[PDB]
Design a protein around this ligand. Sequence first.
Ligand SMILES: NC(=O)c1ccc[n+]([C@@H]2O[C@H](COP(=O)([O-])OP(=O)(O)OC[C@H]3O[C@@H](n4cnc5c(N)ncnc54)[C@H](O)[C@@H]3O)[C@@H](O)[C@H]2O)c1
Ligand SMILES: NC(=O)c1ccc[n+]([C@@H]2O[C@H](COP(=O)([O-])OP(=O)(O)OC[C@H]3O[C@@H](n4cnc5c(N)ncnc54)[C@H](O)[C@@H]3O)[C@@H](O)[C@H]2O)c1
Ligand SMILES: NC(=O)c1ccc[n+]([C@@H]2O[C@H](COP(=O)([O-])OP(=O)(O)OC[C@H]3O[C@@H](n4cnc5c(N)ncnc54)[C@H](O)[C@@H]3O)[C@@H](O)[C@H]2O)c1
Ligand SMILES: NC(=O)c1ccc[n+]([C@@H]2O[C@H](COP(=O)([O-])OP(=O)(O)OC[C@H]3O[C@@H](n4cnc5c(N)ncnc54)[C@H](O)[C@@H]3O)[C@@H](O)[C@H]2O)c1
Ligand SMILES: *c1nc2c(ncn2[C@@H]2O[C@H](COP(=O)(O)O)[C@@H](O)[C@H]2O)c(=O)[nH]1
Ligand SMILES: *c1nc2c(ncn2[C@@H]2O[C@H](COP(=O)(O)O)[C@@H](O)[C@H]2O)c(=O)[nH]1
Ligand SMILES: *c1nc2c(ncn2[C@@H]2O[C@H](COP(=O)(O)O)[C@@H](O)[C@H]2O)c(=O)[nH]1
Ligand SMILES: *c1nc2c(ncn2[C@@H]2O[C@H](COP(=O)(O)O)[C@@H](O)[C@H]2O)c(=O)[nH]1
Ligand SMILES: *c1nc2c(ncn2[C@@H]2O[C@H](COP(=O)(O)O)[C@@H](O)[C@H]2O)c(=O)[nH]1
Ligand SMILES: [K+]
Ligand SMILES: [K+]
Ligand SMILES: [K+]
Ligand SMILES: [K+]
Lengths: 363, 363, 363, 363, 50
Amino acid sequence: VPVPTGGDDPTKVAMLGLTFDDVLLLPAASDVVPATADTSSQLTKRIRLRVPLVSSAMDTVTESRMAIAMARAGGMGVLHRNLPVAEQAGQVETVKRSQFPLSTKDSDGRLLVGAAVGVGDDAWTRAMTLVDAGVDVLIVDTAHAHNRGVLDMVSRLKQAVGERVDVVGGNVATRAAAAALVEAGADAVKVGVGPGSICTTRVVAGVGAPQITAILEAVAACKPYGVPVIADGGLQYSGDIAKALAAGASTAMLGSLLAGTAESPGELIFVNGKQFKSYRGMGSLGAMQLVPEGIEGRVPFRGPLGTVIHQLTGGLRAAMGYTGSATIEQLQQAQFVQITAAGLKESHPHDITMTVEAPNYYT
Amino acid sequence: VPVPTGGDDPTKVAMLGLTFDDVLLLPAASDVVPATADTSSQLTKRIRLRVPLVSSAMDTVTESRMAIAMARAGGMGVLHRNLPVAEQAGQVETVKRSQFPLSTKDSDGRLLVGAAVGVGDDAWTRAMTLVDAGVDVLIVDTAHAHNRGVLDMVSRLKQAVGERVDVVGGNVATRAAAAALVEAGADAVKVGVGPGSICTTRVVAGVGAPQITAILEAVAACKPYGVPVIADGGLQYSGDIAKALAAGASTAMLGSLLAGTAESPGELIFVNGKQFKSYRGMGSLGAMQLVPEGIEGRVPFRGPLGTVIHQLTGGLRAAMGYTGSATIEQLQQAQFVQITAAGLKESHPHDITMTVEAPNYYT
Amino acid sequence: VPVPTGGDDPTKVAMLGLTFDDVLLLPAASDVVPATADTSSQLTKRIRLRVPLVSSAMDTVTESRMAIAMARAGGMGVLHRNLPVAEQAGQVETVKRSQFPLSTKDSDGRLLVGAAVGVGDDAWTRAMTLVDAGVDVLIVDTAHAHNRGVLDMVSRLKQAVGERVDVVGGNVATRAAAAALVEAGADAVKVGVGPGSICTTRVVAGVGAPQITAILEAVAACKPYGVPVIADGGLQYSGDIAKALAAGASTAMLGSLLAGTAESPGELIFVNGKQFKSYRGMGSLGAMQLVPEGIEGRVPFRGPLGTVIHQLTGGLRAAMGYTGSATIEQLQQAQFVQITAAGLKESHPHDITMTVEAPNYYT
Amino acid sequence: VPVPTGGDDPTKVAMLGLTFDDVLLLPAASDVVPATADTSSQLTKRIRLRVPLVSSAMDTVTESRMAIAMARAGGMGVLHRNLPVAEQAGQVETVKRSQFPLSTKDSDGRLLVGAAVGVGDDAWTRAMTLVDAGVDVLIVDTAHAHNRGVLDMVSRLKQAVGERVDVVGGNVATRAAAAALVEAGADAVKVGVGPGSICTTRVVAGVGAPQITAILEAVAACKPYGVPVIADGGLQYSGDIAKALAAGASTAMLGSLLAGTAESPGELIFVNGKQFKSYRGMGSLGAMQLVPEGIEGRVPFRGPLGTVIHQLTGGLRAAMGYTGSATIEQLQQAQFVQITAAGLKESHPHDITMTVEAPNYYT
Amino acid sequence: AKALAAGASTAMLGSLLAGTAESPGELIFVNGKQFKSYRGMGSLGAMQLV
Ligand SMILES: NC(=O)c1ccc[n+]([C@@H]2O[C@H](COP(=O)([O-])OP(=O)(O)OC[C@H]3O[C@@H](n4cnc5c(N)ncnc54)[C@H](O)[C@@H]3O)[C@@H](O)[C@H]2O)c1
Ligand SMILES: NC(=O)c1ccc[n+]([C@@H]2O[C@H](COP(=O)([O-])OP(=O)(O)OC[C@H]3O[C@@H](n4cnc5c(N)ncnc54)[C@H](O)[C@@H]3O)[C@@H](O)[C@H]2O)c1
Ligand SMILES: NC(=O)c1ccc[n+]([C@@H]2O[C@H](COP(=O)([O-])OP(=O)(O)OC[C@H]3O[C@@H](n4cnc5c(N)ncnc54)[C@H](O)[C@@H]3O)[C@@H](O)[C@H]2O)c1
Ligand SMILES: NC(=O)c1ccc[n+]([C@@H]2O[C@H](COP(=O)([O-])OP(=O)(O)OC[C@H]3O[C@@H](n4cnc5c(N)ncnc54)[C@H](O)[C@@H]3O)[C@@H](O)[C@H]2O)c1
Ligand SMILES: *c1nc2c(ncn2[C@@H]2O[C@H](COP(=O)(O)O)[C@@H](O)[C@H]2O)c(=O)[nH]1
Ligand SMILES: *c1nc2c(ncn2[C@@H]2O[C@H](COP(=O)(O)O)[C@@H](O)[C@H]2O)c(=O)[nH]1
Ligand SMILES: *c1nc2c(ncn2[C@@H]2O[C@H](COP(=O)(O)O)[C@@H](O)[C@H]2O)c(=O)[nH]1
Ligand SMILES: *c1nc2c(ncn2[C@@H]2O[C@H](COP(=O)(O)O)[C@@H](O)[C@H]2O)c(=O)[nH]1
Ligand SMILES: *c1nc2c(ncn2[C@@H]2O[C@H](COP(=O)(O)O)[C@@H](O)[C@H]2O)c(=O)[nH]1
Ligand SMILES: [K+]
Ligand SMILES: [K+]
Ligand SMILES: [K+]
Ligand SMILES: [K+]
């Protein structure tokens, strides 16, 4: 009579959530060489990137230098909103005023750049100043996009400057929230609540949703209207990028994987003869200066951004070759297999003493 | 033909139990700002607390100082019964005889306090002495409330001093035990058998049930009759408190989270330059002086109790904002998602060298 | 179309096996005091023990001293068969020739004792010599009792000396093997293939079954005919003994839990100031002097056997009080709840630095 | 309404994949002595090995010495293709031109040997040169055999040199891929995509399938046509070999298990007084000289090959005795039990300080 | 400097040069760090004893 997990309501525990480590991509019939695969994808309904990667809007990840490097690499960067409005507009102008076949450019031939804003009248003034500076895409960047205020802000921005710039809606984790964002007029939906490597929301508040299931649910609401999905947070390997794209996301937003590059803001730190640099959540105590939802830490230095992007894109191309996907649209139709805890350790290198770190696999 | 787990009886392995680490709260459409969320909840059918947290009845957790501080913070404290009867009555008198808007006070304006009693005639004398000293709530505090003697004691206490004080029934882990306590006349039901951080009941005896499933099962029996549920044991984060309340519990009883504060009894101990203090189970060999069901240990010093309570309440408010719950009664209607082991390590911070501890998240 | 785990045969992966760590005992309505519980149980169809515990027939576990101590404590010991026939008969006579209210005795007032034999004509000579020496129960002690030769040996022993002594069949792991042993005429069935703490069978050969499922399957075949079941191996806590009895077994056989006592054969060893003593499988290379199926190691010294037995019986009595079982026969009807990996770490003590080892819970 | 793992497509997450650590073999009625079990099995449709073990085609595993030793031990070796064509043909000639009752030989009495080729016209020239030298079997050795080019190469090789040599098809993980290889004319199918100990494909690309499920799926397509299956990668114990053969595979290909033997190519390395030797994947950066799909490492020294082969065969014989299988074909009809994470640690030695390593179990 | 100040005219170097790229022998990886072999000429391996 009772539900097998307790109680009498079968909907109290709605579903079993899967994350990146729970699934593997199944190989399929292939006619695709990894070098010949096309990795272009839609960032928004009007913007297409050669490489479907976007830099996170964090004060230890993206400033003008990172945005320029990401745009030249074939992606795009999103400037963080921790600095004043005038400084953010200056960074936008620095990017717009700025070897690279894949570089993403607008109609005037200048590099594309995105900028993050919050909610409120101060956020409205920031958004208007950024728009007048020549921004290409505004990110309503919150922790909970299903709030009434976030939806109202997206609606207002679409009404005011929808012709000039694209508007992306903040993080959701359910089908209903994505549907609400689509109804509000968002040109793209960002997915993920709590999976970030520096996030403590799922511990502090106990609220979250595993990223693969969240992407599936959000795509189920966004695809019929042609609204692209950006998987944000929790990606540690190029295989995770491939899994995120196969689940239905159109682009991926990278955090820790880029915080260690030379183009990220911040100096270099030496610890026991090894190089690191600072990486902190935007809900951390230091960043928000309270109940923090992030931590402070450091990540190992990786070097130039181009090399990291090349490794990630090579992994994605290998995945596309394995699944037989000529385009990202075809990759979005691939199938998964669910694995157990033993399958995960089988997947990684095992019963071996690794003698040297590979370029795409770190200890 | 047979049961997939073995045998021919399908009810031999009745159900699959979930605990806090197995679930996450799902975000929902929200109009709630965390600072405006109302955290008040029923402790019993007659007592409403501003902060839904109660201190455990342990000789290393709650005495007069801890009870006074908890009452001032908006919760309540339960005085342990390891000391003689006269001293317990004296501690009740000290608390009653004793800046703090949230402070919980009875009709006379004195701070609320609770006291734990056992089962037997000596426990009856203790209960009468505590009632004569002005206690507001008695906890029949046993490891197994489904025993006939515990139900008899609850019925006797309700018959004798029902009009004067509230009677809370000891720990259960099933629907049937909760129903039996409700029929016996309990004003509140305490849930949890073996989840405590210092318990060895589930190892020494092999008896228990996971906390989320136990709360769901007990709520299924208590909610139709209006009897509140207290989730006792196994809580290490504010997110766990939010999960427990969302599972149908009305209040949470805290152990180790408060044992390291300055208001808990005991002297401060230095180990390798760090500060700790003692924390032991009431079924430990030291506390019960045999077949013990608890251990002795120590927990790090955490400072004043008010800051800890504020961090816990901030996490709870964040959860209420995420789920769109203006009240605790609305939070009790939120939905869960079940996660795997990989989802558990995705929820916590990962692939990062934390450089300093967060106020609400400890290494 | 295909089976969810692969292939087209739904019987290829027959069932999901549970071990001790996968389940917990559900509390039930109780009128039982742990001190008043009755722990007597059948070892065979003719022999009843006051304490349902038996010592393993291993050369680092049971000889004359251990057998005498176990018999005085209320259980029984099984003499190992590594020594020559004459020495085993001498040990049997030493036990029979040998403060202890629970002592298990025959009709003549002498202590009960069991002896292990193998398969073959040499085993027949050993068995006849042991029967002539006054042994009470013979254990056909093999790794695979479903072999034709083991069943033939059991039938021969029952035909020849069935009236004088009881015959116990070696280790099975499935319902069919237990049914075959019952058909052969065994007075008791020993259950467990690979769960021993010193066994490598499930790694070397990949063959075994989780112990709880194996016990349930064996009981489903043995209980209708009134044939007792002995859970052998894998027991590390008293709660595991309670689980094994609740799953339907009538007795439990202990290995490592008794190897560290003073009555076990072997001297005392010092490593880094701590005391240990040797413990090896009978299929280990050292013992069988090849393809070994066991390892050699050492276990910490625990002191006299009586204290260990008292702790185990106290744990069992606590579990009986929790389940409301007046007798072992009633404990055999208790219900389980299945728990996940998170529930298992909730069940043990957590988030605490233990200051001293408990008498029934070790670091 | 939705799929419990997310979305609306029930085939998005096709199945649950099992690996070796997820299953155990069930004991069955037996009349088999391990010393009398027959381990002969089909490698291809025309080649029968006395020991169903083949050495991996890796530059740290198999050269002339290893191939000769494997042929003498009753199996076969596959010469790697990292060296130039002339050198590989010279190795083949060395092996052919070369006490041992189980040695596998052709009609002329010379030792059997196999060689690996890639895809393309250069691989075509290599294959013709190897066939001219007298190789017994060609392995189309790729990471993705469901590619169109691999199938075309298999078809061409069968059309050209079909009557002289047998052609084995590269690694698959799905029923459809095995069916395509069968249609193309393969004489045996090699199964496994990413389970190898030195593979990072499941991390770099996120693509693979757990090995037991993959073997079951491939056997479902290969058994009706009498095409043998070779399980390749992820084997660490002899029990894994038994499980793989029971899943339906006819032979097993071994990597790391043989990389530490005297006959493998490479010198011996000393680290902290212990002996190791190099072991690297063929997709490693060092071996392929780029986006690598393997790592470099080293494995402990194990001694002569014959002892290792004997221990593995002894474990297999023990498994065949447990399951009552006189032949490998009977072992292919055995049954599994699925186990959890707790069952996995029950299977291994536990709660013991292993003092000396066993010949078949290493710490 | 100390050796020269004590009166010696030149210094002969061993381990200080054994780790350079111009020294004979291949490179070895251990725990992510690079090393290379260095043995005395009276070592058992070199002289192939006491
Ligand atoms: N078993 C594995 O999972 C695995 C993975 C990587 C490498 N390897 C080993 O590395 C060696 C070289 O393998 P290789 O195949 O990379 O060599 P390769 O570069 O010679 O590839 C041979 C053919 O395999 C196919 N192929 C390989 N990877 C593909 C992909 N991602 N997408 C589409 N087609 C693909 C292509 O048709 C290619 O022409 C072999 O010894 C192989 O066993 C094995
Ligand atoms: N993705 C995540 O899970 C996550 C979590 C924490 C912080 N962050 C990052 O930190 C920065 C600040 O985030 P922020 O949203 O707290 O900034 P903020 O304080 O500017 O909040 C913006 C709006 O988000 C909504 N909101 C946020 N948390 C809410 C909650 N718990 N309940 C109800 N409404 C809530 C409110 O409408 C609020 O006005 C951003 O850059 C964001 O990406 C992200
Ligand atoms: N919540 C838990 O899981 C847990 C477990 C062990 C101990 N404790 C704490 O230890 C203290 C003492 O508890 P206690 O109950 O052991 O004290 P106690 O010895 O005073 O027992 C009180 C009554 O509880 C019942 N009872 C307790 N354990 C039982 C069992 N195993 N079987 C049957 N009836 C049983 C009996 O009726 C007994 O008279 C309390 O403060 C309690 O909270 C709690
Ligand atoms: N319970 C276990 O899982 C386990 C495992 C290994 C060893 N042991 C212990 O080791 C000792 C010797 O055990 P043993 O059985 O190896 O002794 P043994 O060599 O005397 O075998 C006795 C009989 O068991 C049967 N048998 C055992 N292993 C078999 C196999 N792999 N295939 C087919 N039949 C098999 C045969 O009929 C054999 O004649 C005993 O004390 C036993 O309890 C126990
Ligand atoms: C939680 N999440 C946070 C916080 N600041 C940013 N974020 C989110 O995490 C993403 C990065 O995750 P990685 O796994 O490191 O890639 C960001 O893009 C953002 O969405 C925070 O304080 N808490
Ligand atoms: C088991 N449980 C015990 C014992 N004494 C008290 N308790 C229970 O644990 C709760 C505390 O749990 P924490 O996880 O520490 O917060 C107490 O409130 C009580 O219910 C004991 O000896 N064994
Ligand atoms: C596997 N099992 C073995 C071996 N010798 C004995 N045994 C079995 O183990 C039991 C003891 O296990 P504990 O977990 O220590 O209680 C014995 O009673 C016997 O059945 C061996 O070599 N391999
Ligand atoms: C992944 N797999 C690779 C690579 N080179 C070879 N292999 C495969 O691994 C098998 C050996 O696995 P073990 O677990 O070590 O036995 C080989 O037979 C081959 O199929 C590589 O770079 N990545
Ligand atoms: C002792 N001395 C040895 C050996 N082989 C060479 N040598 C001497 O050591 C010098 C190098 O010393 P470093 O401190 O390493 O610079 C050489 O120049 C030679 O004189 C030997 O086996 N034992
Ligand atoms: K791997
Ligand atoms: K996280
Ligand atoms: K516990
Ligand atoms: K074992």
